[PDB]
């Protein structure tokens, strides 16, 4: 549980926002890329795994599951790569709702930033700090520290 | 001290590696950019602060301390922007040693990657996972969780 993450890919302004969700806390990291390719996905996962103890990634679609470049990054960084089949149909709803929430935040900030990448990082910041009272940023640190101890 | 970070900028291959160090743990985040500008610095700090609870950043030089764009990102993200004067002369030697270690790691991986940005992220991963015994990634999570509790 502390090492499980889910990839998620959503679109805005003709670009692609790639998101990794720490399943047990709801914490996220995200980036803006021109298109989702195996090479962009692989680099994003190398970055994530040098920052958090990533044990498993549920890929966002079959092409990133299949991609030998994505598998090569998961090998390099010690990540178990898995599919993202929603055996719990609850997952489908959680992702869709998260995407709708991020797009709403992005719209509320969009005019403070010239570039979409700035607005997406402002939305990562707001989502991780939001108290729902603990934040997702507090939950992920508590969960992993509990696991280290 | 759980919220205190230090910026650091080093050069390799005609490019700039910008690094944020969590001073109490030694944990790092890093990116490759073509040149250090206040806009690039500001974006990097906005990314960092959406991911960890950044209270204070000691800037790496006077230009990023002065930069109104860097101050605007520190305002947006709720960061106190401070100078990086090594009133403790130990700071100066710790950064130099860190940069030398990162460059050594980058050379040990350099030939597994086409692009420098991949080698830099492999070096972040190796640095943060290295047990010295706990890793910097373990220390930063323990420090902040202890603070939250």
């Amino acid at each position: 549980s502390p090492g499980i993450w889910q990839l998620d890919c959503t679109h805005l302004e003709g670009k692609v926002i790639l998101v990794a969700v720490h399943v047990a806390s709801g914490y996220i990291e995200a980036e803006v890329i021109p298109a989702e390719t195996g090479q962009e996905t692989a680099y994003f996962l190398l970055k994530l795994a040098g920052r958090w103890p990533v044990k498993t990634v549920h890929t966002d679609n079959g092409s990133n599951f299949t991609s030998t470049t994505v598998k090569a990054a998961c090998w390099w960084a010690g990540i178990k790569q898995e599919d993202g089949i929603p055996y719990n149909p609850q997952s489908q709803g959680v992702i869709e709702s998260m995407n709708k929430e991020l797009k709403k935040i992005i719209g509320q900030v969009r005019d403070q930033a010239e570039h979409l990448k700035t607005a997406v990082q402002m939305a990562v910041f707001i989502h991780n700090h939001k108290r729902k009272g603990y934040s997702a940023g507090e939950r992920i640190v508590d969960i992993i520290a509990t696991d280290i101890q | 001290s759980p919220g205190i970070w230090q910026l650091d900028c080093t050069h390799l291959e005609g490019k700039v590696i910008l690094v944020a160090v969590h001073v109490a743990s030694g944990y790092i985040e890093a990116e490759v950019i073509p040149a250090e500008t206040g806009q690039e610095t500001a974006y990097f700090l906005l990314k960092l602060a959406g991911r960890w609870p950044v209270k204070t950043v000691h800037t790496d030089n006077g230009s990023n301390f002065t930069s109104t764009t860097v101050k605007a990102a520190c305002w947006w993200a709720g960061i106190k922007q401070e100078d990086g004067i090594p009133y403790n002369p130990q700071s100066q030697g710790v950064i130099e040693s860190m940069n030398k270690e990162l460059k050594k790691i980058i050379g040990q991986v350099r030939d597994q990657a086409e692009h420098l940005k991949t080698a830099v992220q492999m070096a972040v991963f190796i640095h943060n996972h290295k047990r010295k015994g706990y890793s910097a990634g373990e220390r930063i999570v323990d420090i902040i969780a202890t603070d939250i509790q």
Partner: peptide, 8 residues
């Protein structure tokens, strides 16, 4: 290119 970031 036989590299982790460029398998070709």
């Amino acid at each position: 290119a036989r590299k982790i970031d460029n398998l070709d």
